[PDB]
Design a protein around this nucleic acid. Structure first.
Ligand SMILES: [K+]
Ligand SMILES: [Mg+2]
Ligand SMILES: [Mg+2]
Ligand SMILES: [Mg+2]
Ligand SMILES: [Mg+2]
Ligand SMILES: [Mg+2]
Ligand SMILES: [Mg+2]
Ligand SMILES: [Mg+2]
Ligand SMILES: [Mg+2]
Ligand SMILES: [Mg+2]
Ligand SMILES: [Mg+2]
Ligand SMILES: [Mg+2]
Ligand SMILES: [Mg+2]
Ligand SMILES: [Mg+2]
Ligand SMILES: [Mg+2]
Ligand SMILES: [Mg+2]
Ligand SMILES: [Mg+2]
Ligand SMILES: [Mg+2]
Ligand SMILES: [Mg+2]
Ligand SMILES: [Mg+2]
Ligand SMILES: [Mg+2]
Ligand SMILES: [Mg+2]
Ligand SMILES: [Mg+2]
Ligand SMILES: [Mg+2]
Ligand SMILES: [Mg+2]
Ligand SMILES: [Mg+2]
Ligand SMILES: [Mg+2]
Ligand SMILES: [Mg+2]
Ligand SMILES: [Mg+2]
Ligand SMILES: [Mg+2]
Ligand SMILES: [Mg+2]
Ligand SMILES: [Mg+2]
Ligand SMILES: [Mg+2]
Ligand SMILES: [Mg+2]
Ligand SMILES: [Mg+2]
Ligand SMILES: [Mg+2]
Ligand SMILES: [Mg+2]
Ligand SMILES: [Mg+2]
Ligand SMILES: [Mg+2]
Ligand SMILES: [Mg+2]
Ligand SMILES: [Mg+2]
Ligand SMILES: [Mg+2]
Ligand SMILES: [Mg+2]
Ligand SMILES: [Mg+2]
Ligand SMILES: [Mg+2]
Ligand SMILES: [Mg+2]
Ligand SMILES: [Mg+2]
Ligand SMILES: [Mg+2]
Ligand SMILES: [Mg+2]
Ligand SMILES: [Mg+2]
Ligand SMILES: [Mg+2]
Ligand SMILES: [Mg+2]
Ligand SMILES: [Mg+2]
Ligand SMILES: [Mg+2]
Ligand SMILES: [Mg+2]
Ligand SMILES: [Mg+2]
Ligand SMILES: [Mg+2]
Ligand SMILES: [Mg+2]
Ligand SMILES: [Mg+2]
Ligand SMILES: [Mg+2]
Ligand SMILES: [Mg+2]
Ligand SMILES: [Mg+2]
Ligand SMILES: [Mg+2]
Ligand SMILES: [Mg+2]
Ligand SMILES: [Mg+2]
Ligand SMILES: [Mg+2]
Ligand SMILES: [Mg+2]
Ligand SMILES: [Mg+2]
Ligand SMILES: [Mg+2]
Ligand SMILES: [Mg+2]
Ligand SMILES: [Mg+2]
Ligand SMILES: [Mg+2]
Ligand SMILES: [Mg+2]
Ligand SMILES: [Mg+2]
Ligand SMILES: [Mg+2]
Ligand SMILES: [Mg+2]
Ligand SMILES: [Mg+2]
Ligand SMILES: [Mg+2]
Ligand SMILES: [Mg+2]
Ligand SMILES: [Mg+2]
Ligand SMILES: [Mg+2]
Ligand SMILES: [Mg+2]
Ligand SMILES: [Mg+2]
Ligand SMILES: [Mg+2]
Ligand SMILES: [Mg+2]
Ligand SMILES: [Mg+2]
Lengths: 154, 386
RNA sequence: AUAUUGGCGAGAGACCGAUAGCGAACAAGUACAGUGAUGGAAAGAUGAAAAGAACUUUGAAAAGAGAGUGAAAAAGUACGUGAAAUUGUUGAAAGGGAAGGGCAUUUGAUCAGA
RNA sequence: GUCGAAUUUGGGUAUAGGGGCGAAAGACUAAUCGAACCAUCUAGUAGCUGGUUCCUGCCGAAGUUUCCCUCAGGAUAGCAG
RNA sequence: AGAACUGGCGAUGCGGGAUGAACCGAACGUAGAGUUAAGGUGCCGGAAUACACGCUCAUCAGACACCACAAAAGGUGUUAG
RNA sequence: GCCCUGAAAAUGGAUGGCGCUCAAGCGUGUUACCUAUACUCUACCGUCAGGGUUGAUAUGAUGCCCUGACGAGUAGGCAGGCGUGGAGGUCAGUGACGAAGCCUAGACCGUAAGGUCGGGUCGAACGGCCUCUAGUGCAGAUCUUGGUGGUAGUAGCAAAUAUUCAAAUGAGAACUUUGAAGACUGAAGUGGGGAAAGGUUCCACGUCAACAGCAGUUGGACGUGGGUUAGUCGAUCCUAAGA
RNA sequence: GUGAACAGCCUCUAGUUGAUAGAAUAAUGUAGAUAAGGGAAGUCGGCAAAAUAGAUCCGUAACUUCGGGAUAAGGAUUGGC
RNA sequence: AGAACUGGUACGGACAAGGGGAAUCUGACUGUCUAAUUAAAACAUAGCAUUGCGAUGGUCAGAAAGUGAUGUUGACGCAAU
RNA sequence: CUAUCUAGCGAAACCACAGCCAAGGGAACGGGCUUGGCAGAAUCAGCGGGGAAAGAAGACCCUGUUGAGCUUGACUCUAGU
RNA sequence: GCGUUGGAUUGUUCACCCACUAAUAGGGAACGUGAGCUGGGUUUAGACCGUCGUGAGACAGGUUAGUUUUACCCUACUGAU
RNA sequence: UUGGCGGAAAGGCCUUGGGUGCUUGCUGGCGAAUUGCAAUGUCAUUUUGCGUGGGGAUAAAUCAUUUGUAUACGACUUAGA
């Protein structure tokens, strides 16, 4: 429990989280922001299309010197990617949230991603060897991912 | 300190930036000065560069070492089917330049030109100009009112013409639409000519004539990102050079503490708009005219098409303009041929050229025969046929 | 009678309170490095009590959502509290080649005193 | 370059720091050599470089005299509290 | 580069000299009002496109000391002796 | 006198800029006007000085009050204060009905060091005053230790010819296994054994949190076990340089 | 097997198929190459590269310590049957 | 070793594999060194020459020794250049 | 084969704050200050003008009453003889 | 505005000569330009010679050999969204 | 409502006829107060949203696929009911 700041009704919402997931934090942040606020089924279809390279995840903050693609145009950006590992983790948490909403008795057809946040887990440390007998860090940037889907209402 | 040895700078600073042209059809940025006593006529034409061949002609140049002798010259063939007039644009002069006041279109537009207004033609409803065609409902009152405005104003008149790209061997299938200034004064009758030619074709022979010096406006062949050595013609650095030698060694002095615009840098090469002038028309050939590639000395009944077809283009089945030399742009590219902006009387112009022979051998190799009949005559009977 | 940074047994302190105090509050002269002489760390705290999360559900699983234990899970062994740098989300605001600041007031938000 | 003898090389063994060893470069002597490494003397000395942690109030300089193995320092008088 | 007297900067902000350690003015607790210094009053920019007598036309005019340069020699240019 | 010639330097640029020609230029004169932390007056703060006031209810005579003048400041000196760890006394101080700590573009007080309060979090001690004491205040020291960024999802993971198809397993297969194919080491091997060294890496089963700079169901990994059989092979014995 | 050959190249037994991959084919690179005519004019300097190359036969100068120089130089031939 | 025949005159057809000549300076040569910027003309070398010494000795070690290297040696030797 | 784009993986140097110019003055070569020119999000591949770019408390020079290697009838000694 | 060269010698700037040419003008830009190159010279350590010095060593005296590191950041520029 | 003129950015100017409201050109009748002695004492136009009625119309672009006149990636150029 104790997710990030939310403003939705806990009785109309369902939560899902994953901690210390060995997936890139920056890629997963971009993936989460790509579906923040989307309807659940639309977001899942979009993630499947991202995995199929039919649509892309726009990279807005962590995008320096990444590359350009025509698939960022629908988001009004030139820089977009297809972070498959992040997408897979996100859709796993999305299906977990959908299962929790079904167990809570929420209407799956009104579910939208009312909250999704990715922050940095503790780094997993490895070593890389460099010229002239030097050693540098080779750490991972794992993620804590949390999301809550809420029934759309008025 | 000084350069320590003088040399001219590499490249022309008047052709900057060396960027991609904004459009594949190079813009006509200047039309011939209007002579308002002449009949109304087009000042340019649209064609497609088909390819190059070579010709033989008797040089008429008194005082030259080759006077009254045979010379072999390279020529470029531009396939120029007649262009269809589909509109007229009126241009009023303003303290801020020329300004289009209104455009009057033809009632019926072919699918060739309608495709130009669509990015996705196959899945569109083809609604373009469907409400505009209703302006011609009973008497065309709105059309006549707009034409009357063009007559009452619009000191400069241009017609909208489009190519018949379906008559070319190109797969593009989407016509090229361009504005051509109407020279021949009485703006009233400029508009009258445009309206009377609405939906009608204009043949290249009504614009251009034999021996006339014309200008070719086209986007050059693109070559992508290029280094300084070929983009600008700078000296190759010695073999000993660390970090590469296809570079410019000094891209600037310490001060100004900036790379200057005049220093050669790596970047895009080609796909630039170029207006090259003074290309003499060697032939105004007609599409329906069999023996197109024949002359009064050759008499071999052959078309202008080389054996096996123009490489990467196809066969010439339409009217064509054969100009001396080469013109910017590659084969299949739209090129605008425009009348010269001045009167050339240098005895290079005003020369009347008479072709003696036109090469129709294959450009797909070391072509040996001008015609299949000549190939049969030389080779005899083969096993497969002939 | 005098000395005593060793050994053994005691009593104390206006001393230090885990980067301090012996290097070592803990399997510390340990792990580890060096051929060797030698060099030599880091590392304390759930909770009164494991009562350390039965059971259900999603997932291949890790885990999640519940349920539950507990005074508290804003104590879940990655455990007392839980700063800052740095980061995510939400909310607010501003943004023509920095940002930040001083005086003054407009506007928005917020608030004390009477 | 050299490649059948002043050849290359394993193992054993000997030579240890102002010492060894050197077909000699101050070369090599465990990534250390115009004096190895380790610990201690040792928190070595430094007129030289860097830093030197709260507020407010009042007063408020000197780069000048003489002497010094003195000239990037000090003593002395002067200025200041 | 080295001396003499004084005033300063260092140690000093403030108004002016666009800008500047030293120049000009003036030295400073926190505020209000008035008046000024040096400097300015076409606009930037607060303040007269004020008043008055003349001089200058520059195909490199000139426009406030320190200060950011100009000389000898010349000109029926023009003005006054 | 003004103007002009004399009068040539390097990025494009400087009466400060624009611009200005009976000037907005030059020389001169007269007024009006603008504004400094300067002058004048007043208020407040502090400092210094000179005084008045123990005649009581006057508990603050280092107190209260009156008067005048003054206020720049590095190095530096002095004074009055703020804050921290611990100590003696005291407030029979605060506190599990919540101490300390922390967060808080919420409030109050002080010129300030700082102090106080509200709210949230939290869980066991802590504070005011009079004094004592010091390992007592950090922005720097290429400061020490630890942690964390931008760079940046960037540089890059390109030597050693080269991989491909299907099936099985598996949640997941470019990388595991099998089969088929294509290749290489080409006997001075990428083969088969050993010496030094390592020490279980050998083998089997289970198994993938970490490691194998991609992956992984695989492994020299992880977990549990099994395995090294000598009169004849070595050591042991001999002596060598030497110890 | 070719070949003088433990050279280079291909193959047999044995072993491996292990190097992060996929898609494109810009500049500039790293490595490998070619180039008309000229032939060191480049450059400090032929650096780099090219040219020559095995074997058989012919022929081989100055100088010389008589041993060499020497594969001097310079030429011809090479397959298959 | 020779002959005939034969072919796009190719043929050490891949692989493999000297460029050569005329001279100057320098070191005779083979060899050796600055491991990690200097391979050389530097060092060494054979050859030549000088020096000391007949053991109660020459040269050189050791703090000292009833100690030691040359020396299991003896001038055709050892030691120092 | 890179570079490029993608999936996975994923550092380091450096970093007062940062990053458009011209002139001025200024510690006499400004990214900031003054006066002008100007100035429109977010970016990709290259590039080597600039950041008096980074790498190192300049190795050159000087100073220090700071050393060390080496030399010599420097001063003062000393093993040996 | 436009051009101002090809070479022999020298590391050379400079110089000189050959030659073509319309001409072979002078200069600046951190004596422009080394994260552009190169490293011939100078200017570390090796070595030789001459002179000097008793010597270690000295020599704008000559000679030979002697590692030229990093851009992925910002701007500027070139192109591209 | 009749008609004309105006294209430099016209988007406005002029004009015909009738209807209709006001008319302070002149003469009257009624009302105003207490906003308390002032407090802009709210009278304008800029966009947007929403609801109620009426009028009008019934598409494209991009991704994906494809082309190569293009290209590092974007982009460009093509084709596809
Ligand atoms: K030394
Ligand atoms: Mg970028
Ligand atoms: Mg890149
Ligand atoms: Mg490495
Ligand atoms: Mg190593
Ligand atoms: Mg020049
Ligand atoms: Mg060309
Ligand atoms: Mg090189
Ligand atoms: Mg051809
Ligand atoms: Mg400790
Ligand atoms: Mg703890
Ligand atoms: Mg609690
Ligand atoms: Mg933690
Ligand atoms: Mg905690
Ligand atoms: Mg924080
Ligand atoms: Mg910008
Ligand atoms: Mg030496
Ligand atoms: Mg000390
Ligand atoms: Mg004072
Ligand atoms: Mg003395
Ligand atoms: Mg000093
Ligand atoms: Mg000073
Ligand atoms: Mg002053
Ligand atoms: Mg000035
Ligand atoms: Mg004004
Ligand atoms: Mg004069
Ligand atoms: Mg003058
Ligand atoms: Mg003025
Ligand atoms: Mg005047
Ligand atoms: Mg005042
Ligand atoms: Mg007093
Ligand atoms: Mg003071
Ligand atoms: Mg203490
Ligand atoms: Mg509390
Ligand atoms: Mg805060
Ligand atoms: Mg407790
Ligand atoms: Mg302390
Ligand atoms: Mg600190
Ligand atoms: Mg400080
Ligand atoms: Mg630091
Ligand atoms: Mg640190
Ligand atoms: Mg990369
Ligand atoms: Mg690489
Ligand atoms: Mg490989
Ligand atoms: Mg593989
Ligand atoms: Mg297999
Ligand atoms: Mg091979
Ligand atoms: Mg093979
Ligand atoms: Mg095994
Ligand atoms: Mg891995
Ligand atoms: Mg893995
Ligand atoms: Mg095991
Ligand atoms: Mg035996
Ligand atoms: Mg054989
Ligand atoms: Mg050639
Ligand atoms: Mg040739
Ligand atoms: Mg030749
Ligand atoms: Mg030459
Ligand atoms: Mg040359
Ligand atoms: Mg030369
Ligand atoms: Mg060579
Ligand atoms: Mg020969
Ligand atoms: Mg010879
Ligand atoms: Mg030799
Ligand atoms: Mg030999
Ligand atoms: Mg070396
Ligand atoms: Mg070498
Ligand atoms: Mg010698
Ligand atoms: Mg500048
Ligand atoms: Mg200057
Ligand atoms: Mg700067
Ligand atoms: Mg400015
Ligand atoms: Mg670069
Ligand atoms: Mg630079
Ligand atoms: Mg220094
Ligand atoms: Mg130093
Ligand atoms: Mg001294
Ligand atoms: Mg000494
Ligand atoms: Mg220079
Ligand atoms: Mg440079
Ligand atoms: Mg360099
Ligand atoms: Mg240079
Ligand atoms: Mg050199
Ligand atoms: Mg040297
Ligand atoms: Mg001598
Ligand atoms: Mg010298």
């Amino acid at each position: 429990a104790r997710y990030g700041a939310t403003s939705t009704n806990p009785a109309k919402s369902a939560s899902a989280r994953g901690s210390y997931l060995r997936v890139s934090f920056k890629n997963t942040r971009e993936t989460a922001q790509a579906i923040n606020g989307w309807e659940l089924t639309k977001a899942q279809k979009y993630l499947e299309q991202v995995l199929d390279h039919q649509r892309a995840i726009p990279f807005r903050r962590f995008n320096s010197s990444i590359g350009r693609t025509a698939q960022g145009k629908e988001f009004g950006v030139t820089k977009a990617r297809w972070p498959a590992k992040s997408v897979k983790f996100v859709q796993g948490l999305l299906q977990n949230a959908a299962a929790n909403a079904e167990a809570k008795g929420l209407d799956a057809t009104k579910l939208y991603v009312s909250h999704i946040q990715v922050n940095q887990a503790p780094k997993q440390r490895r070593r890389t060897y460099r010229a002239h007998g030097r050693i540098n860090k080779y750490e991972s940037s794992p993620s804590h991912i949390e999301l809550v889907v809420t029934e759309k209402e008025e | 300190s000084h350069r320590k040895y003088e040399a001219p700078r590499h490249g022309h600073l008047g052709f900057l930036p060396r960027k991609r042209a904004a459009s594949i059809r190079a813009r006509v940025k200047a039309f011939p000065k209007d002579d308002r006593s002449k009949p109304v006529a087009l000042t340019s034409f649209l064609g497609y560069k088909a390819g190059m061949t070579t010709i033989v002609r008797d040089l008429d140049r008194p005082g030259s070492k080759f006077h009254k002798r045979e010379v072999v010259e390279a020529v470029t063939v531009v396939d120029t089917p007649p262009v269809v007039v589909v509109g007229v644009v009126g241009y009023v002069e303003t303290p801020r330049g020329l300004r289009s006041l209104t455009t009057v279109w033809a009632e019926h537009l072919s699918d060739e030109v309608k495709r130009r207004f669509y990015k996705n033609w196959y899945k569109s409803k083809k609604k373009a100009f469907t409400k505009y065609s209703a302006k011609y409902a009973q008497d065309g009152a709105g059309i006549e009112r707009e034409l009357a405005r063009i007559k009452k104003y619009a000191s400069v008149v241009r017609v909208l013409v489009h190519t018949q790209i379906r008559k070319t061997p190109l797969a593009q299938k989407k016509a090229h639409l361009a504005e051509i200034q109407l020279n021949g004064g009485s703006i009233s009758e400029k508009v009258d000519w445009a309206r009377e030619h609405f939906e009608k074709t204009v043949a290249v022979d009504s614009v251009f004539e034999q021996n006339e010096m014309i200008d070719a406006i086209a986007v050059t062949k693109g070559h992508g990102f290029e280094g300084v050595t070929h983009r600008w013609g700078t000296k190759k650095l010695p073999r000993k050079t660390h970090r590469g030698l296809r570079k410019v060694a000094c891209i600037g002095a310490w001060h100004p503490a900036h790379v200057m615009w005049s220093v050669a840098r790596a970047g895009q090469r080609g796909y630039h708009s170029r207006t090259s002038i003074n290309h003499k028309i060697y032939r105004v050939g007609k599409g329906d005219d069999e023996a197109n590639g024949a002359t009064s000395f050759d008499r071999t009944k052959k078309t202008i098409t080389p054996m096996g077809g123009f490489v990467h283009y196809g066969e010439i089945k339409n009217d064509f303009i054969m100009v001396k030399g080469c013109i910017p742009g590659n084969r299949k590219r739209i090129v605008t041929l425009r009348k010269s902006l001045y009167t050339n009387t240098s005895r290079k112009a005003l020369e009347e050229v008479s072709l003696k022979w036109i090469d129709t051998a294959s450009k797909f190799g070391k072509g040996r025969f001008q015609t299949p009949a000549e190939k049969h005559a030389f080779m005899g009977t083969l096993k497969k046929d002939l």
